[PDB]
């Protein structure tokens, strides 16, 4: 599309999730 | 010959700054008195007229903002 | 004949903003004074009789805008 | 004779600004001094006096607007 | 004896804008100096004994309008 | 060559604070008259003619903030 | 050298707040005539240079609050 | 050295209150002049320099309120 | 010493109101010149230091309000 | 001695007024100028003093209201 890539006028170019399983995203500080 | 007179009004700017720009000037009778100018007009004719001759960069385009 | 018009009074924005315009000479008995213009004058002059004369382009016309 | 005063005004103008407007003048014994007027004035002046003469076209009527 | 009013008043205000308006004059051991007036005042002089003068119109009445 | 123009300008600041910028000067006959620059601008001369030069951190970027 | 031109503008700010900052001294023929610097400054100024310099504690982090 | 420090400051104060603060001295031949200085910056100056020294206590803290 | 101190204070504030404040004193070559204050800070300070000494009060506190 | 006090304050303020305060006396070679008050300032001390010594009531307080 055109909002998944860089956004408007560079706008979020640093804005990269680190697409994982919930898991991933749970168990490392969910204590 | 930019970069002459370019170097001349920086001389001159500093020579003001310390404490060396004669006003008046006077010796038996034959005396002489310079107009002064005030530091800040110097300034700002060194910066545009730096900004004409082919002086290196020193000025950018706004500045872009992003998250 | 502009064009020397536009040099001297360069020149004398010059030798005003370093240190080179005298407001008043003397010799004991000889003396004679100049009456003082501002700098922001001059560079009005300047400008003015600058963009008159048959010299290039130096100021462009608005600006545009686009997405 | 407008001719001669405009320019007759405008060197004066010239004058003044460079550095040469004389104010005062001594020799030993025998002083006067000319009164000094502003700039800003001797422009209107010189303005007035320059379309009060049948000089060519300065001033255009307002401006048009048109999509 | 006004047209010559207007005369002498024009002259005067030519002599004060360029250079020939003398505010004090000085031989040896004598001296006098005279009141020096103002330009706007001067102009507002001119104006109002020029328009009590026969001499010709020089301003007009309002500007009206129609589409 | 902008070390030792620090230290001069430094220097300059240092006599001109406490008691040590001459104004003027005079022998019988020979005398001399400097222009007298304020106190901030020859501050923010120092300040910028340092930052500029290979003169160390002094200043940092903004404050964060954090709970 | 920070201690010694500490010390300096401190007598400095001393002697001109008593009686003793000096600005003009002439023996006949040979006149100075040192600048002089208001007290505000000059106070700033030697608070700058001392925070600057390793004496010290005379400051504190804002203030806290409670109950 | 601050006690002889607060008593030269009370003394000066004196001095310029009533009439005996000297600003020149001329001699037929050697004058010297001091520059004066506003009695308000004196007094903040003996107040501050009387605060920080080891006299005792002269002003308390903030004001409490009791019904 | 406070006291005819006080008193001396008084005695030059009087001098001062009627005619009597010297401030300048000249003679064959000799000459010199007393710092002039204002008559407020002069008046504030007799005040506040007849205050401080022990002598009969002359202020209250506040006022009362009663029906 | 404040009844002659009275006198003196009166008397000079009568002198300043109409022609009779000396602001400086010069015979050759020696010379003297006295501060000048103000004379608002002269008559609040005149008020002053006046009300401060035994002499009888001048001002009475505040004002009733009845209908």
Excluded: C
Excluded at chain 2, 37 to 48: G, M, N, P
Aim: without cysteine; charged residues 25%.
């Amino acid at each position: 599309y055109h909002g998944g890539g860089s956004g408007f006028g560079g706008q979020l170019r640093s804005w990269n999730p680190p697409s994982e399983s919930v898991d991933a995203a749970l168990l490392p500080n969910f204590t | 010959t930019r970069q002459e007179e370019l170097a001349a009004a920086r001389a001159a700017l500093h020579d003001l700054m310390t404490g060396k720009r004669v006003a008046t000037v006077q010796k038996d009778g034959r005396r002489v008195e310079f107009t002064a100018t005030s530091v800040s007009d110097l300034k700002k004719y060194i910066a545009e007229l730096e900004v004409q001759t082919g002086m290196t960069q020193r000025r950018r385009g706004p500045a872009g903002f992003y998250v």
